[PDB]
């Protein structure tokens, strides 16, 4: 199968060739078929060498006023074409054989084959010809309504927003748009990913002739659905007006779902197999547009749009730096841009990199602008004196007195002096000129969350290594448990540890770290104590296994965890004692842990290198008591083996470690009581109460009130009345006035 040249041109010519009792198709059928008028309306590649194509055209039309000569044309053109590496014969190659389709007259205008045509062809479509359509084998070849906003004209003006690194998307769009069935590409991603810039980028490619000119007519128009009542009716009336023009196509830049105002809005109306365009969806809109319909699904091809990388986001922001500077009237630092992109990338979990980067560069810039509102005050004081003096001279002019001698003159010259002073204060006082990187960003982010803000001042030393003391002091006992855990965390530094995957099983008494450590970890690890998520096991055991992961295997069931947990991809998930978990749960944990990913019915993949799970357990009901002469490792191995005998081995094999927790000793009881003092201090030193418990009572109390598998519970009742009622008394006392440190 050849190009459409001399195939479809002929099909059209035949529609229009019903003329002369033609014994067969002659060359003149096509030749005349290659024009709109039997006039020059004359540009074949040999027109430039020796052929008066305008005369050839008149002579061929006059001639009529395959055939044996057409066959010689076909055979010669193709044979020479093969020799010249022109696999299919086009208009610039048909000349090789055009035996019939020439001014075969005395004063002839005849074609060349392997002499000049092969050279003139380079100027024609020529060298860049791999694939199979045509060269627009015609003539010169060698209503746009308000619902069709023209982007290519804006592209031509030069005011559209370019996209960095998204040529693959434009390329794929062109390929899809040309098709008959899967022919409406859609861009996939959340808005902000760069989809709006891609749609605009297409319009730019068109005006810059980076595309074959087809889009010259099939211009980028944007669809403005209009409402402020039914409007689909208008879309249909306009669509008919546009389709009749048959030139331009309507795009969605970022968002489209099925709407109630056909769910496939305007689509059966325009289901003509033409005027293909890029639609645009997100993970959920795709589902709610295309998958939801599932009929027209056969007519779409998603084009996945990734977010720009730090390098690409920085490049667009630096390119756009001039625009932002003009609006902020400040300089925006390049370092600030690099930092804004990087620090937002670390801080924001809510948006794509361009959005979180932009939100930050405007806040950093805004702060410079607020500070720069004025000259780095004394002037204002001078102005206030000027206004005062002005008012006083008003009184001076009005005074109904006998006297520019004294009243008027005094105030007039005082004002003149102050006026010069106001000007001088401005001139010799010549906020911030330019934004900063870490300093402004730390302020913006610290403002938004604070807490060293934790991803700004973290160089991965404090939360990887110093982590051991933070976690241990938060949770007293078995520092070896803590050490194993901090090692698991530091191993992920630079991806030394599998980049796409933490997991621990915590066994022991209550009040020793089985649950306490998971929260302490979230506090340190994410700079967020509420990054810890607790999951009850009965709640998801069997009948509710479907609430752990969304199922639909057998409403919009988000389960209880998939929808909610997904909102925070920076988290510690604490599972209740797993011996209460159903094998389905363990199989789920296994599937989820591998490759670090979310296994659901939505596809909202989470890079789990940003999460960790902690599962408590009491399988080692007696084994945990080995602490009461075995060391950490020996106990660990014993509990590991028993866990293996209960939970699936494959699941268990994805666990970083089995952690030994352990009843606190008196030294440890004193340490947790001490932590209470720190808590009370944090709660009250703010009532301004500083706290020291009389030493006799302090130690006696911590030493006595223990509970082997809870924490120091017996201490509690004596203390609320001994300490809290007393601290209330300190307020009512005044001897041990708040700020002093004495209690019982």
Numbering used by the authors: 5 to 69, 80 to 112, 116 to 159, 162 to 247, 255 to 287, 296 to 464, 466 to 536, 539 to 591, ...
From the paper:
The structure of ClpC on its own was solved at 8.4 Å resolution using ~90.000 collected particles. Surprisingly, raw images and subsequent 2D classification revealed immediately that ClpC assumes a conformation different from the canonical hexameric arrangement of AAA+ proteins. Attempts of 3D classification and refinement using the existing ClpC-MecA structures failed to give a refined map, indicating that on its own, ClpC assumes a substantially different conformation. Indeed, reconstructions revealed that ClpC without MecA assembles into an oligomeric assembly made of two open spirals that interact via head-to-head contacts mainly mediated by the MDs. Additionally, high-threshold noise on the open part of the spiral indicates higher dynamics of this region, suggesting exchange of subunits. Accordingly, for peripheral ClpC subunits there is not sufficient density to account for all ClpC domains. The AAA+ domains are staggered with a rise of ~20 Å per subunit. N-domains domains are packed between MDs and are displaced so that they lie on top of the adjacent small AAA1 subdomain. The MDs coiled-coils constitute the backbone of the spiral and mediate the spiral head-to-head contacts, which involve residues F436, R443 and D444 providing a structural rationale for the activated states of respective MD mutants. We envision the helical ClpC assembly as a dynamic inactive resting state, which will interfere with substrate binding, association of the ClpP peptidase and interaction with adaptor proteins.
The bacterial AAA+ chaperone ClpC associates with the peptidase ClpP to form a central proteolytic machinery of Gram-positive bacteria. The ClpC-ClpP machinery acts in regulatory and general proteolysis, controlling multiple cellular pathways and differentiation processes and is crucial for bacterial stress resistance and virulence. ClpC activity crucially relies on cooperation with adaptor proteins including MecA, that target specific substrates while concurrently stimulating ClpC ATPase activity. Here, we report on an unexpected mode of AAA+ chaperone control involving transition between an inactive resting state and a functional hexamer as revealed by determining the cryoEM-structures of S. aureus ClpC in absence and presence of MecA.
